[PDB]
Design a protein around this ligand. Structure first.
Ligand code: 2AK
Length: 168
């Protein structure tokens, strides 16, 4: 459990690896995997789509039941659901979608959710379709998260860019 290998230590508590977060979850068996969620927990693409596909749609079936009963999340908010075959727990965190005019300031609130878990496997929040600058997201992660966070970045050129930012 929580067998993270090959990570680069950026700060006392933030580590980063050029890896596919699904293959990391399968290798590492983390207590917590973080999903880059939306407020309706519709896992139709990006990390959310990849994680749900890896669970054989278990995640989407559970999420649909959660939303029908409980209503949507708030931007900056989170819920803990089953980690299925990937982790003990999935922390579904909603970062702002700046592509849709949501406030980038809520990225701090999104990362604050990580502090309720001792160790996490996570993507950068508000990246990809959510439209935030990934170098900014990593800075907010480092500034906000006090617990141990292992970041998985799939794209090599983005990974090198991110590492060249805290180290150059
Ligand atoms: C200055 C600098 C830049 C990059 Br990208 C790096 C490093 C150091 C590392 O040590 C590493 O692994 N990637």
């Amino acid at each position: 459990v929580n067998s993270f290998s090959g990570y680069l230590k950026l700060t006392d508590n933030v580590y980063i690896k050029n890896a596919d977060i699904v293959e990391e979850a399968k290798k590492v068996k983390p207590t917590v995997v973080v999903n880059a969620a939306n407020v309706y927990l519709k896992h139709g693409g990006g990390v959310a789509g990849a994680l749900n596909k890896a669970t054989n749609n278990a995640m989407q079936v559970e999420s649909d039941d959660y939303i029908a009963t409980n209503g949507p999340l708030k931007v900056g908010g989170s819920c803990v659901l089953s980690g299925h075959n990937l982790a003990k727990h999935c922390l579904h965190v909603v970062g702002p979608n700046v592509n849709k005019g949501e406030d980038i300031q809520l990225l701090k609130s999104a990362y604050e959710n990580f502090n309720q878990h001792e160790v996490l496997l996570a993507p950068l929040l508000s990246a990809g379709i959510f439209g935030a600058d990934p170098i900014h997201s990593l800075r907010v992660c480092v500034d906000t998260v006090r617990t141990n966070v292992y970041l998985a970045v799939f794209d090599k050129n983005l990974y090198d860019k991110l590492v060249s930012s805290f180290l150059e």
